[PDB]
């Protein structure tokens, strides 16, 4: 429990009227719902990166709002409006950079943006909900019009107003502009398997942001294994039309700068297990005397590998 420094990866495994992890299908899917069966707060599910939520300062889009209104509907003042909008955008970027690491001042106004969406989660003020009969729409906006960010309501109601919110403390997404805080879509979603959208209404449950990990060492994290023997890392390539694991012979002098994107490896624990994040398969070894290969997944017991202490 510590002050929620702005900018840290966040996540709200809601445990109100229902329990589930709040996220979206990703890509262009314009809907934010929960996945009760996907995972648990105490039992995090796979694809942990899907929960990446960066905390950013409230967006300022006054000149941006004026420019949008002008675009919707003069020409002479358009250049001045564009210049003012550019200045406002620069100011907004500066403000967002300033709050980096800022403690969660109970009652302060911030926003949470999904890394996959790379946009601020906002609520459609004058828009009905996609499914709920008597609710409003909400999606992820690329930039936002000051409605992207909302207030943090101390659902615990213990931390002092303005106090640095303890990470994991009971909080709710109080609607700054709408006034109706986040409400779990109890609707029995059929189109989306295990779907429970988030609306802007007056409810009695919410979720609290949880800080992510800024990665006898780190466990379930995706890192790269560089073989000091070869002074490089063992990546995977589509050689001869088939996936093959080999040490890349990079023609770049800077060995440490060889971020080929094929060095994606995930580590698991049991009582490590290596998963080839480059192709989504799992590494393994077989006969040649022996050679390394990739299989669909590490579920097979044969996928075991040994890490030796320095």
């Amino acid at each position: 429990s510590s002050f929620l420094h702005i900018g840290d990866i966040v996540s709200l495994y809601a445990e109100g009227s229902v329990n589930g992890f709040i996220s979206t299908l990703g890509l262009v899917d314009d809907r934010c719902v929960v996945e009760p069966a996907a995972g648990d707060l105490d039992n995090p599910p796979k694809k942990f990166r899907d929960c990446l939520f960066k905390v950013c300062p409230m967006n300022r889009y006054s000149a941006q709002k004026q420019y949008w209104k002008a675009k919707q509907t003069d020409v002479v003042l358009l250049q001045k409006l564009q210049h003012a909008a550019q200045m406002e955008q620069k100011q907004n970027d500066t403000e967002n950079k300033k709050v980096h690491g800022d403690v969660v001042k109970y009652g302060s106004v911030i926003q949470l943006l999904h890394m996959k969406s790379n946009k601020y989660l906002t609520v459609n003020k004058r828009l009905p909900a996609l499914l709920e009969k008597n609710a409003m729409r909400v999606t992820l906006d690329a930039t936002g019009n000051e409605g992207s960010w909302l207030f943090i309501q101390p659902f615990w109601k213990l931390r002092s107003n303005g106090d640095n919110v303890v990470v994991g403390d009971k909080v709710i997404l109080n609607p700054v502009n709408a006034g109706q805080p986040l409400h779990a879509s109890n609707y029995e979603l059929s189109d989306n398997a295990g779907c429970k959208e988030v609306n802007s209404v007056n409810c009695n449950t919410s979720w609290k942001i949880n800080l992510f990990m800024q990665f006898v060492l780190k466990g379930g994290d995706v890192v790269r294994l560089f073989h000091a023997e070869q002074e490089k890392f063992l990546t995977c390539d589509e050689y001869k039309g088939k996936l093959q694991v080999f040490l890349r012979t990079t023609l770049r002098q800077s060995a440490t700068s060889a971020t080929s994107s094929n060095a994606l490896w995930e580590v698991e624990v049991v009582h490590y297990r290596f998963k080839h994040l480059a192709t989504g398969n799992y590494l393994a070894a077989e006969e040649n005397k022996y050679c390394l290969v990739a299989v669909p997944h590490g579920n097979d017991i044969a996928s075991l590998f040994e890490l030796d202490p320095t």
Binding site: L27, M115, K116, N118, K119, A142, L277
Partner: protein, 120 residues
């Protein structure tokens, strides 16, 4: 995040290429293709998603790792395959700008712009 986005984009592009080479894509399919193209353009440019015109991308320096991944991850191959299939004959390049094939022309232009950005 960029790697995950690239993997998702590769899967979506493979599906879209298969659908296009197979048969027509409904209005929902066309909208999905347009959204995929927009997401790819945004990721490649790396610039904030402002109200700038789609074919108005001007960045200082693209993400070298992102560009390398896109080239290796068949993203460029995906764009090339989309371009090849759209002509083969799915589109004759003559009935464009006739108020009927406008979405296809817009998608082709977006793909070309994304390829050019990747060629930065």
């Amino acid at each position: 995040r960029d790697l995950d986005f690239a993997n998702d984009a590769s899967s979506m592009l493979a599906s879209a290429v298969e659908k296009l080479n197979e048969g027509f894509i409904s209005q929902n399919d066309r909208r999905f293709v347009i959204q995929l193209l927009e997401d790819l353009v945004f990721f490649v440019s790396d610039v904030p998603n402002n109200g700038q015109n789609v074919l108005d991308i001007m960045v200082t320096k693209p993400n070298r790792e992102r560009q390398k991944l896109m080239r290796e991850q068949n993203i460029l191959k995906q764009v090339f395959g989309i371009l090849k299939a759209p002509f083969r004959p799915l589109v004759r390049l003559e009935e464009l700008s006739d108020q009927k094939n406008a979405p296809y022309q817009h998608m082709f232009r977006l793909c070309y712009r994304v390829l050019r950005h990747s060629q930065e």
